[PDB]
């Protein structure tokens, strides 16, 4: 619990469900299995430097 410790160990958005943390991601992303990371769908996901 605690999105205070380190964003609940999330990748992007971190929220709280009166006991545990719930992670989420920006439009164009999908929450991985571990329910913490985020992953793109297209080759040009918002927020990433096109390197």
């Amino acid at each position: 619990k605690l999105c205070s410790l380190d964003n609940g160990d999330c990748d992007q958005f971190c929220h709280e469900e009166q006991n545990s943390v719930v992670c989420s991601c920006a439009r164009g992303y999908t929450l991985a299995d571990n329910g913490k990371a985020c992953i793109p769908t297209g080759p040009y996901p918002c927020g990433k430097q096109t390197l």
Binding site: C14, K48, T50
Partner: protein, 235 residues
């Protein structure tokens, strides 16, 4: 951008640049998607007709990856006025889809509470643009980015000589000669969290450029999100 570095290839992919008929760059933008741009409200005065450009990194050298888009509709904020500069925000819907490629990707709109709690509490942020290089200078030719520390809301109101409302927020340096400036307006202010940049603020106003005892006043994006949506869903 006074001081600061230069946007290397692929580093500031969300930057947009409004250009007048004279093809001149007068303001900046933020690519929120393939169809919508986020700019300042006062940037919608300094001109008659204007286009939005992307992929540009050098304003006089065909980098081949540039591209101009026309403006289908312009959504300026109703509560805005020049007398206070409050509600400095506007959203542009493109006439034809932005094709994301190198030097052309969009930035993320974060959630309100999470942005205010973990983004704007972050130490620094990133401001970028083609604006002037020193207060009395000329539009820059190359694209610049400046790391601008977040400023204590209090100091903000003091140091200022204008009402710093809830829709805006200070950012920059007190003494250091680094700040955004004329032309950098509408530009993007983004915070970085884990290698994914977020749209935290819109470049708005300041007293001079890089002046001691003064900061960069940016528009609080978190305080307009719901609006940015009702604007993209068009309204």
């Amino acid at each position: 951008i006074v001081g600061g570095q230069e946007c290397k290839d692929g580093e500031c992919p969300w930057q947009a640049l409004l250009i007048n008929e004279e093809n001149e760059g007068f303001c900046g933008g933020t690519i929120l998607s393939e169809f919508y741009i986020l700019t300042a409200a006062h940037c919608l005065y300094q001109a008659k007709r204007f286009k939005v450009r992307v992929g540009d990194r050098n304003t006089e050298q065909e980098e081949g990856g540039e591209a101009v888009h026309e403006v289908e509709v312009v959504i300026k904020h109703n509560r805005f006025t020049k007398e206070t500069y409050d509600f400095d925000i506007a959203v542009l819907r493109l006439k034809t889809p932005i094709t994301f490629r190198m030097n052309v990707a969009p930035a993320c709109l974060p959630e309100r509470d999470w942005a205010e709690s973990t983004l704007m509490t972050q130490k620094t942020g990133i401001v970028s643009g083609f604006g002037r290089t020193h207060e009395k200078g000329r539009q820059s030719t190359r694209l610049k980015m400046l790391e601008v520390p977040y400023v204590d809301r209090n100091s903000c109101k003091l140091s200022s000589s204008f009402i710093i409302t809830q829709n805006m927020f200070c950012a920059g340096y007190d003494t250091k000669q680094e700040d955004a400036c004329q032309g950098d307006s509408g530009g993007p202010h983004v915070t970085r969290f884990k290698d994914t940049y977020f749209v935290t603020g819109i470049v708005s106003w300041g007293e001079g450029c890089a002046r001691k005892g003064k900061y960069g006043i940016y528009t609080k994006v978190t305080a307009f999100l719901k609006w940015i949506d009702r604007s993209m869903k068009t309204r």
